[PDB]
């Protein structure tokens, strides 16, 4: 520990409980390297992906990516670990130019402003 970092220690303190829980579950799943036929099965649930969406919106608050998961786009346990610890809650991203984003009126906003042209009067 003589060579370390305070932030690293803080992150360890925050994430240790969840990491230990996940590791224990995984170890119980693969006992003796034989696929135990009694442990709970690995399945995808809507709650986990809801948590992932919450995390994605939180990240978007920092202005790192653009997403349309906020309800305003269309009108017409709290695990303390990074997303990659729970691969069964991730959602692949979409190209920002091909996202279903609507204005207040109810018309879909066109993202290809390069190729748009104006009809002469």
């Amino acid at each position: 520990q003589t060579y370390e970092d305070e932030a690293y220690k803080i992150w360890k303190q925050v994430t240790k409980k969840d990491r230990a829980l996940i590791a224990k579950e995984r170890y119980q799943l693969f006992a003796n390297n034989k696929l135990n036929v009694e442990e709970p099965a690995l399945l995808r649930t809507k709650a986990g992906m809801r948590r992932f969406l919450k995390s994605r919106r939180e990240a978007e608050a920092l202005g790192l990516i653009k997403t349309a998961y906020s309800d305003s786009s269309v009108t017409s346990a709290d695990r303390a670990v990074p997303s990659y610890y729970e691969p069964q809650t991730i959602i692949p991203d979409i190209d920002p130019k091909l996202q279903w984003v609507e204005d207040g009126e109810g018309q879909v906003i066109n993202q290809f402003e390069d190729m748009l042209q104006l009809v002469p009067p």
Binding site: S76, D95, L98, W100, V108, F112, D114, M115
Partner: protein, 523 residues
């Protein structure tokens, strides 16, 4: 009783009681593996090509050798200039033939290469195996991969070691490993690889549930109900929709600009184009086997062949009398068939302006079409009084099967990939599964709402079926339920819903993933 009539009729009739392909494939496989292996893997290109060209010259097909040399010269014009010019007999050829090529390689790399070559034995791997066995000898080693900055090279250069037998025998590893900077058992090893590989097959299915699949949905906005058809290119790069205003619009599914071969349109910036020239509603579109051709049929009675390189029409076919409702390319893309209002199916080939086969026998209009995966049989269905499916023979144009049992309008048809199954759907939500050879209904699925099922699709291995309906749903069916370990049928795996978006098209990609398509209507 039908059996008595059939027996009486049958009794009354007296019924008694070459190398370039492999080279390209190997190059395409080599540029796939990791960069670590490529350095050594590239060493196999020159000997194989040289030996193949020499054999072709000796075999008497000098034309093939010339074609190979002129084709592949650009790939070695910066390495083998002198040798390539020589190839344009001398002692060089005799020396090459006498001494078999030496190529160092690692054990794991050799095993991976042998496994890959066995996997594609009939696709061209046999030629490479024979060439390597006969005209080549590879000295396997237990060292690590040879790279300009790998552990092996660094150790050899730093510790001032001496070359080995493989290193001794125009690029040579000496220039790199020097301060100035085993054999093989082919044939037998193939038997060992086959025996080991055959031990890892799955030969059953019991208990459990169906497969899970994903789905990507493409929605179209502001259509206002003037869309009649849809289609995706075979590689899912373009999408075309035919409208009720007689024109067709082609998009790019990734948004990248489209390209035209006309010089006047050099590097123009647009990601969607239009194809004009029809004079009525368009009811069918079919991307060719990238895709460079497109078909379309309308209510004026014409079939048009477009071009996706210059974006203009090329020909018109005028063999129909009345509306044309469906059109379809062949499974490989030279023949196409069309059916319409006048109760007749026709088979065209793009080389001829007239139908090569006419197929009579239906009693009412046609409403569906399909092709057999081997491209010699065609399916069709009719509506109204005569709701029967038929199977014609392209060679003779005579029906060979009839399937009966439907009671509603038939909206779609689809033939399995293995070639022994047929699926059809109607406006009552029923899906049928037919056994082609025995002409017997295997089972009926259920669950879809009334309104129609415009499209169907089969998995890669022909074990899963996905159907999209006009009730804004997508459903996945299991053809064969798992063996028990001791309103809706019990073989519906999944059923998704869309936000007021009827589905007009569903496709099965290579993976367990599908792509859909529909028109969004707020009302």
């Amino acid at each position: 009783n039908l059996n008595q009539i059939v027996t009486d009729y049958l009794k009354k009739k007296g019924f008694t009681r070459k190398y370039l392909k492999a080279f390209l494939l190997l190059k395409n496989w080599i540029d796939n593996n990791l960069d670590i292996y490529k350095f050594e893997l590239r060493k196999l290109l020159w000997p194989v090509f040289v030996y193949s060209y020499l054999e072709l010259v000796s075999q008497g097909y000098v034309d093939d050798a010339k074609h190979l040399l002129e084709t592949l010269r650009s790939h070695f014009e910066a390495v083998h200039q002198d040798q390539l010019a020589l190839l344009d007999e001398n002692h060089t050829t005799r020396l090459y033939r006498e001494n078999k090529y030496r190529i160092p390689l690692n054990q794991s790399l050799s095993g991976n290469l042998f496994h890959f070559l066995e996997r594609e034995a009939d696709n061209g791997g046999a030629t490479i195996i024979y060439i390597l066995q006969t005209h080549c000898s590879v000295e396997t080693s237990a060292r690590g991969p040879i790279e300009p900055y790998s552990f092996e090279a660094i150790y050899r250069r730093a510790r001032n070691l001496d070359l080995d037998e493989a290193d001794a025998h125009g690029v040579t590893n000496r220039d790199v490993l020097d301060t100035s900077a085993r054999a093989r058992d082919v044939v037998m090893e193939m038997q060992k690889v086959r025996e080991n590989r055959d031990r890892f097959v799955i030969e059953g299915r019991t208990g459990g549930i169906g497969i899970p699949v994903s789905a990507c949905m493409f929605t179209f906005h502001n259509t206002l109900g003037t869309v009649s058809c849809m289609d995706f290119s075979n590689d899912h790069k373009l999408v075309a929709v035919g409208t009720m205003d007689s024109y067709i619009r082609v998009w790019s599914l990734d948004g990248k600009p489209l390209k035209s071969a006309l010089e006047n349109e050099k590097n123009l910036k647009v990601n969607n184009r239009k194809l004009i020239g029809h004079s009525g509603p368009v009811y069918g579109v079919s991307f060719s086997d990238s895709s460079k051709l497109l078909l379309s049929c309308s209510a004026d009675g014409q079939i048009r062949l477009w071009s996706l390189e210059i974006w203009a029409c090329l020909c018109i076919y005028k063999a129909h009398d009345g509306p044309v409702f469906r059109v379809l390319w062949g499974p490989h893309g030279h023949y196409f068939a069309s059916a319409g209002w006048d109760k007749t199916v026709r088979v065209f080939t793009q080389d001829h302006a007239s139908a090569v086969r006419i197929m009579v026998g239906h009693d009412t209009s046609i409403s569906a079409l399909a092709w057999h995966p081997n491209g010699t049989y065609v399916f069709s269905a009719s509506d109204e009084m005569d709701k029967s499916i038929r199977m014609w023979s392209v060679i003779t144009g005579n029906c060979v099967r009839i399937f009966t049992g439907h009671t509603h309008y038939i909206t779609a048809l689809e033939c399995a990939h293995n070639g022994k199954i047929l699926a059809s759907a109607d406006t009552g939500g029923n899906i049928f599964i037919w056994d082609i050879e025995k002409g017997t209904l295997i089972k009926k699925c259920r669950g879809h709402g009334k309104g129609g099922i415009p499209s169907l699709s089969f998995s890669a291995e022909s074990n899963v079926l996905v159907s999209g309906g006009l009730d804004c749903t997508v459903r996945v069916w299991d053809i064969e339920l798992p063996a028990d370990p001791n309103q809706i049928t019990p073989d519906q795996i999944s059923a998704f819903a869309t936000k007021k978006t009827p589905v007009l098209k569903v496709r099965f990609t290579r993976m367990n993933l599908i792509v859909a398509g529909g028109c969004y209507d707020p009302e």
